[PDB]
């Protein structure tokens, strides 16, 4: 079956690990902290075709690591995650998209913009803001909650669709 290397990026605390854990383990655990910055494998059926998702859950690295750039470079599609209650994390999306563009040597990498923690009423980033940005980038925008499961599988499956139709 086709394997898809998916990479999850974004500021610390936005829910990258929780999104991955929801997809892989089908639960949400407050404040859980993975211990490996590892990859996760899941066999899924998307639009009738079985495939293997290989998910890289990134941690924040503030300096230069050629190894970390090479792990990113193996990725075929990227989730750019911010949290809808965290204005700073939305402002950070630009630097993550620039990083992917640099390491992939391409401006048009399969990508989905993800606004996580949509269960929280205390929104500071309006959906229209992210919709505008996603449309400027030419990529889908999906709102998720790793806590309630809303949008989680759709974010990953939409990313695969973006790879398939790239
Ligand atoms: N309410 C809510 N909390 C979340 C959600 N996703 C993650 N969290 C919590 O936000 C904190 C940071 O999440 P984490 O997965 O470690 O973010 P990461 O640093 O991007 O990997 C943790 O306490 C999570 O339990 C969500 O969708 N809704
Ligand atoms: Ca944490
Ligand atoms: Ca596009
Ligand atoms: Mg994490």
Swiss-Prot record:
User: Which InterPro entries does its entry note?
Assistant: P-loop_NTPase (IPR027417), Small_GTP-bd (IPR005225), Small_GTPase (IPR001806), Small_GTPase_Ras-type (IPR020849)
Main localization is membrane
How does the record say this protein sits in the membrane? Answer: Lipid-anchor
Instruction: List, alphabetically, the SMART domains matched.
Output: RAB, RAS, RHO
Where is GTP bound in this sequence?
13-18, 29-35, 59-60, 116-119, 145-147
Q: What is the effect of changing residue 61 to R?
A: Promotes interaction with SHOC2 and PP1C
Known regulation of activity:
Alternates between an inactive form bound to GDP and an active form bound to GTP. Activated by a guanine nucleotide-exchange factor (GEF) and inactivated by a GTPase-activating protein (GAP).
Q: This chain belongs to which protein, by name?
A: GTPase HRas
Q: Which organism is it from?
A: Homo sapiens (Human)
């Amino acid at each position: 079956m086709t394997e898809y290397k998916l990479v999850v990026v974004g500021a610390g605390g936005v829910g990258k690990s929780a999104l991955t854990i929801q997809l892989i383990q089908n639960h949400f655990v407050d404040e859980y902290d993975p211990t490996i910055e590892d990859s996760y494998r899941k066999q899924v059926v998307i639009d009738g075709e079985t495939c293997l998702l290989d998910i890289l859950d990134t941690e924040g690295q503030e300096e230069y690591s050629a190894m970390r750039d090479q792990y990113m470079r193996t990725g075929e599609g990227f989730l750019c995650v911010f949290a809808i209650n965290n204005t700073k994390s939305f402002e950070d999306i630009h630097q993550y998209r620039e990083q992917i563009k640099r390491v992939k040597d391409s401006d048009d990498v399969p990508m989905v913009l993800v606004g996580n923690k949509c269960d929280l009423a205390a929104r500071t980033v309006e959906s229209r803001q992210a919709q505008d940005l996603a449309r400027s980038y030419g990529i889908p925008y999906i709102e998720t909650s790793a806590k309630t499961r809303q949008g989680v599988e759709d974010a990953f499956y939409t990313l695969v669709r973006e790879i398939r139709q790239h």
